[PDB]
């Protein structure tokens, strides 16, 4: 025989009205919603909205200078103001710190604020007594957090504050 070998592929070329979605499927949305939500105005609008985490973000943004952008005047009074707010509006200070993950470390926030207030920065007033007291609150918060080393560290910092406070 001499037929049947090498079958010509004919009667093919159908089912084109389906079109695999793996090809030729523009499903890209022209809406950069996520972009403007990652913008300074949003963080601070949410800071004014009442979002504690967002307040901490803008605070550290003013402090670190990074997200504040370097083309803007570095003010630490606004930062201080926001740190105050976070501490004053937290419900984990009066015996309500039972989350497990300390995403808001009271003692470290207090410590930073203390240092800020005790140093100054031209625009921020140096109030030694507030810093001393703040170190004590920080260290006590650390004691409560079973952070003995940090407590005695800022306590030693506190002792030096009142030692230099005697002027």
UniProtKB/Swiss-Prot annotation:
TM stretches of this protein: none
Superkingdom field: Eukaryota
Subunit field text: Monomer or homodimer. Interacts with Calmodulin/CALM1; this interaction is strictly required for phosphorylation activity.
Protein family per UniProt: Belongs to the protein kinase superfamily. Alpha-type protein kinase family.
Described function: Threonine kinase that regulates protein synthesis by controlling the rate of peptide chain elongation. Upon activation by a variety of upstream kinases including AMPK or TRPM7, phosphorylates the elongation factor EEF2 at a single site, renders it unable to bind ribosomes and thus inactive. In turn, the rate of protein synthesis is reduced.
Protein's recorded name: Eukaryotic elongation factor 2 kinase
Organism, scientific name: Homo sapiens
